[PDB]
Paper text:
We expressed the [name] [name] with an N-terminal 6xHis-tag in E. coli and purified the protein with a Co-NTA affinity column followed by size exclusion chromatography. We employed mass photometry to reveal that [name] predominantly exists as a dimer in vitro. We determined the cryo-EM structure of the [name] dimer at an overall resolution of 3.7 Å. The three HDS domains (HDS-1, HDS-2, and HDS-3) were partially mobile and had weaker densities in the consensus refined EM map. We next performed masked local refinement, resulting in improved EM densities in these regions. We found the structure of [name] alone is almost identical to [name] in complex with [name]. [name] dimerization is primarily driven by hydrophobic interactions at the core DCB region involving Phe-171, Leu-167 and Val-209. Beyond the hydrophobic dimer interface core and at the edges of the dimer interface, electrostatic interaction dominates at the N-terminus of the DCB domain. Indeed, the homodimer of [name] is globally asymmetric due to the conformational difference between the two arms of HDS domains. Interestingly, the [name] heel-like motif is highly dynamic in solution; it is invisible in the [name] alone structure and becomes visible only in the [name]–[name] complex.
Residue numbers in the entry:
A (entry chain A): 175 to 259, 321 to 440, 454 to 874, 887 to 990, 1004 to 1064
B (entry chain B): 7 to 30, 70 to 259
């Protein structure tokens, strides 16, 4: 009651932190109660809602500044329940929300698995999910909370996904992951790539229940994320130095859609995969609302992003060559379009940009060379420091470098760092002594001064973050060691205090941490955190790259992804349509096939379009190439009609899939706008289906009667029937009432298929090929089996 | 707010559907239908909130379901409320909230031992307090709020329950009384000239027995 009131909002950070501690201790302590625990959980949920709502109305601080991650992640611990039996003294703000997020992380920490129960971890994940769903982008604006979400919370999420079996923790973890990807997906690209790769790996090889839950949550991911698979394609497949997340995702979905994949997997997965594929097709179709395909054809240039995306395989080959040996890799990179020129500026730019798919230790070993020492001077000139209190400069330098073991190369690295630090910061003669806590106008060492300070910093890190070294290093000893420093003077007390504390409660992050096993997950996440979340420069972009793309380029990306993943999708769609048995699933499948035909016709994919149409024709089971039931024409004694009872008649009347595919096929033919899209097999199939539908059933030879009336010729001779009877019941007993009504149903379907306007009158289907095939498919022989209609 | 509430709705729908499937028919069908309808959507406009809440309210009101399922349903309802999924900018929000409160009032279930019953009843009472003490609860109806008073007071006075549940019911009753008379402070007074005669009967309303539960 207090917290959810203005009086609560006028409290202090320490008080509200103690409130959080006590309420959460009551909520997540066994042996207390159940009703009391639920009340405490609801109270904690409400308090979190209020806290982050208050966070929503606080302006950001230092928007233009660059943040160097230095705060520790193990400063808050949930103290044991004992109730019964800026700075503090302010009015809330960022300190309380930061400490609350830190405590929540301590709840779900991957190194605290043995110290907390599963209900506590699920509750912590739920609290984090509520906080995210309340704050979102406004939370993304602030740097420390975004760091605590990027590195450690997502590390915990990935660890839980990889190494859990309770499935109740897994459900909460997957829900939080989906919430993160939906809300703050555009700023957590690397984490999403890693998590999705792990999920695909686990899903393609543990009980089936885990895979079912994984696929269900990831399914709820793609439906609601705006225009999925194409944002993923753009951000990952076309960005290089990453993995083809979208293409691999679609390939795994196609591999998991067949019933052969329904085996040794939960049977509810295949419908989910089919929904995903249908969603991709529908998204592509919706992207073609009003595009005027002529305009698409008029386009000449291709997006340079796609051009580089087509060059990715040779990029991987060049990267492997570079990792093997730089003296051979560099000529290979400069031969192709990756490296602009042999100028060291371009080489430094490349070595700075793509520090994700380049062996960092190999980079360090290469860069120690003399010519590579000149390259190193240019490369560190490429950096940007603007102060950073020396230690943050060291962190920046070591983010994308593995220091070689030998001391000579370390000396070269540190001296180049000193020179670049001097160059990138213009010192001033102020040089204020104590009683000056800032670093811009005050601390101003020299080249050898910062050299000594940086060597001391490295020594302090390697001495204070190794458990195998007895004792530690104190502030007094370190300060005494750094006597005889800048300007032959000593550093200020505040400066050394800050440096010592910063290197104390944070280990310097370095890439290529280990090589082996038993720490593979820690190594992977270290090579992730080394890239981001140590530097968080907010670009304040309006949205993801999706919105800043013109509709033509969006359609181009759709065309590329379809070119990659089309044949597989259409193959699995036809497979499941053949297997399918239910009415609704078959109708949805054939609608998806119709949309696929439309999309193939839009992008002028002749092979795919003819493949899908020919598959429809062969599934029609009406144009097969390679017992005999004579056809019977039915005329009543009243209300004269025509009911031809033939083999194909009953075969069609007892084929739901047959009629569905016929009507869809002729609808597709109706929609067509180009004649030079079909194939010879396609034209043969359509001419044959129309001919066999003319032999019997309902295709009257009244097509284009205007010409017949022009020459005053009579109606065409109707093909004779094999066994024609006239009924007086309104004998030899050939027809049956149910087969009669089945033939009537087939007649109704065929007359509803509007064949005449579908095939002939479309102003485009009338081309040389159609009439040429019509003439070639003629008959010139007088056998009895065909004399019934030969003339 | 600004957090695409349709995503929260679909998450709760898939959660409840998965729970029912694991525990194991019209309720699951309604959840699936709502799932599809919301999936083919982009915001919450042009669709009445009563349709969104109807499966959840129906699964709350039904008597022959397990306590775990209705507990999950009530948790989903409270998450819907606390995130303001249904607001003043939604169709039939008056009807939606009135239906939610009506379904809560006549809640029933069956299942496990007294601890689970106490937990689900506590969730019910918390949701009723959260909704009445809010503006939306102020925009309820006379009969609905009278029924809320009847149910909460009956639960409080019943001696066959636990102690914590009775304390929670007492606290909620005090809060609801405070809210009712605080609203009474704002109503424009009735005729101050005509003389009133106390012909209205003094005893017609008798507290009913507890009905929510097994």
């Amino acid at each position: 009651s207090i917290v959810d009131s203005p009086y609560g909002d006028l409290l202090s950070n320490s008080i509200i932190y103690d409130v959080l501690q006590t309420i959460l201790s009551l909520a997540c302590n066994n042996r207390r109660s159940e009703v009391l625990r639920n009340a405490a959980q609801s109270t904690m949920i409400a308090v979190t809602v209020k806290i982050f709502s208050k966070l929503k109305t606080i302006e950001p601080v230092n928007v233009n500044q660059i943040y160097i991650n230095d705060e520790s992640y193990t400063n808050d611990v949930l103290k044991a329940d004992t109730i019964g039996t800026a700075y503090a003294d302010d009015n809330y703000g960022l300190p309380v929300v930061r400490q609350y997020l830190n405590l929540l992380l301590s709840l779900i920490a991957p190194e605290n698995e043995l110290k907390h129960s599963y209900s506590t971890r699920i509750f912590g994940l739920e609290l984090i999910q509520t906080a995210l769903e309340i704050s979102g982008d406004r939370l993304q604006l602030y740097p420390r909370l975004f760091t605590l979400i990027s590195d450690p919370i997502f590390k915990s999420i990935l660890f839980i996904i990889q190494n859990t079996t309770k499935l109740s923790l897994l459900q909460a973890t997957l829900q939080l992951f989906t919430t993160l990807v939906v809300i703050l997906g555009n700023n957590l690209q690397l984490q999403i790539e890693l998590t999705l790769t792990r999920i695909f790996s686990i899903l393609l090889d543990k009980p089936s229940i885990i895979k079912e839950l994984l696929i269900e949550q990831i399914s709820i991911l793609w439906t609601r994320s705006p225009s999925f698979f194409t944002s993923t394609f753009i951000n990952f497949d076309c960005n290089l130095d990453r993995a083809d997340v979208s293409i691999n995702f679609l390939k795994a979905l196609t591999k998991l859609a067949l019933p052969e994949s329904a085996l040794t997997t939960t049977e509810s997965v295949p419908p989910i995969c089919l929904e995903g594929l249908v969603s991709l097709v529908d998204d592509m179709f919706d992207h073609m609302k009003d595009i005027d395909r002529e305009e698409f054809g008029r386009q000449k240039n291709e997006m340079e992003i796609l051009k580089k995306r087509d060059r990715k395989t040779e990029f991987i080959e060049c990267t492997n060559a570079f990792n093997e040996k730089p003296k051979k890799g560099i000529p290979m990179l400069i031969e192709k379009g990756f490296i602009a020129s042999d100028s060291d500026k371009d080489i430094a730019e490349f070595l700075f940009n793509n520090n994700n798919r380049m062996n960092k230790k190999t980079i360090g070993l290469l860069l120690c060379h003399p010519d590579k020492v000149s390259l190193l001077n240019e490369y560190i000139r490429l950096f940007d420091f603007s102060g950073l209190r020396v230690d943050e400069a060291i962190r920046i330098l070591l983010t994308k470098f593995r220091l070689p073991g030998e001391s000579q190369q370390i000396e070269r690295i540190i001296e180049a760092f000193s020179s670049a630090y001097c160059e990138n910061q213009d010192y001033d003669p102020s040089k204020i002594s104590d009683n000056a806590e800032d670093d811009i106008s005050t601390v101003q060492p020299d080249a050898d001064s910062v050299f000594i300070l940086s060597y001391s910093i490295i020594m302090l890190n390697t001495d204070l973050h190794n458990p195998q070294v007895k004792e530690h290093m104190s502030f007094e000893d370190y300060s005494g060691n750094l006597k005889g420093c800048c300007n032959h003077k000593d550093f200020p007390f505040w400066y050394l205090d800050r440096i010592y504390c910063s290197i104390r409660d944070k280990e310097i992050v370095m890439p290529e941490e280990h090589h082996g096993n038993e720490k593979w997950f820690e190594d992977a996440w270290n090579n992730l955190i080394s890239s981001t979340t140590v530097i968080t420069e907010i670009k304040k972009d309006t949205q993801s790259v999706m919105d800043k793309l013109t509709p033509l380029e969006l359609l181009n990306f759709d065309r590329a992804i379809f070119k990659q993943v089309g044949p597989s999708i259409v193959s699995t769609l036809f497979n499941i349509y053949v297997v399918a048995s239910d009415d609704h699933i078959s109708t949805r499948m054939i609608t998806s096939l119709d949309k696929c035909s439309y999309i193939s016709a839009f992008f002028d994919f002749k092979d795919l379009f003819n493949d899908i149409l020919n598959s429809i024709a062969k599934g029609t089971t009406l144009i097969n190439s390679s017992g005999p039931m004579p056809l019977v024409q039915i005329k009543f004694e009243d209300t004269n009609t025509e009911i031809p009872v033939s083999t194909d008649a009953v075969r069609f009347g007892r084929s739901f899939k047959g009629q569905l595919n016929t009507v869809v096929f002729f609808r597709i033919i109706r929609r067509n706008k180009d004649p030079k899209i079909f194939s010879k097999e396609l034209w043969l199939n359509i001419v044959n289906i129309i001919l066999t539908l003319y032999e019997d059933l309902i295709l009257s030879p009244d097509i284009f009667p205007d010409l017949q009336k022009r020459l005053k010729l009579s109606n065409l001779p109707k093909p004779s029937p094999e066994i024609s009877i006239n009924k007086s019941k309104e004998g030899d007993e050939e027809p049956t009432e149910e087969e009669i009504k089945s033939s009537k149903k087939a007649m109704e379907c065929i007359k509803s298929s509007n064949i005449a306007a579908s095939v002939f009158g479309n102003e485009s289907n009338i081309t040389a090929d159609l009439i040429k095939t019509l003439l070639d498919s003629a008959k010139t022989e007088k056998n009895a089996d065909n004399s019934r209609y030969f003339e | 707010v600004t957090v695409d509430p349709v995503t929260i709705i679909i998450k709760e729908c898939i959660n409840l559907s998965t729970a029912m499937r694991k525990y194991s028919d019209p309720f699951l069908s309604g959840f699936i239908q709502l799932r599809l309808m919301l999936n083919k959507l982009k915001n919450l406009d042009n669709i009445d909130s009563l349709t969104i809440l109807q499966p959840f309210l129906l699964i709350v009101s039904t008597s022959s379901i397990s306590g775990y399922i209705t507990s999950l349903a009530l948790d989903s309802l409270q998450k819907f409320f606390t995130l303001n999924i249904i607001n003043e900018s939604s169709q039939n929000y008056i009807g939606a909230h009135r239906a939610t409160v009506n379904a809560l009032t006549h809640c029933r279930f069956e299942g496990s031992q007294q601890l689970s019953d106490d937990s689900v009843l506590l969730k019910v009472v918390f949701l009723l307090r959260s909704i009445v003490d809010s503006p939306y609860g102020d925009l309820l109806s006379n009969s609905i709020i009278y029924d809320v008073l009847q149910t909460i007071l009956s639960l409080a006075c019943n001696n066959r329950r636990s102690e914590v549940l009775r304390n929670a019911a007492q606290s909620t009753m005090i809060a609801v009384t405070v809210k009712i008379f605080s609203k009474l402070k704002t109503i424009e007074p009735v005729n101050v000239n005509q003389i009133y005669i106390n012909d209205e009967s003094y005893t017609n309303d008798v507290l009913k027995a507890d009905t929510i539960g097994t």
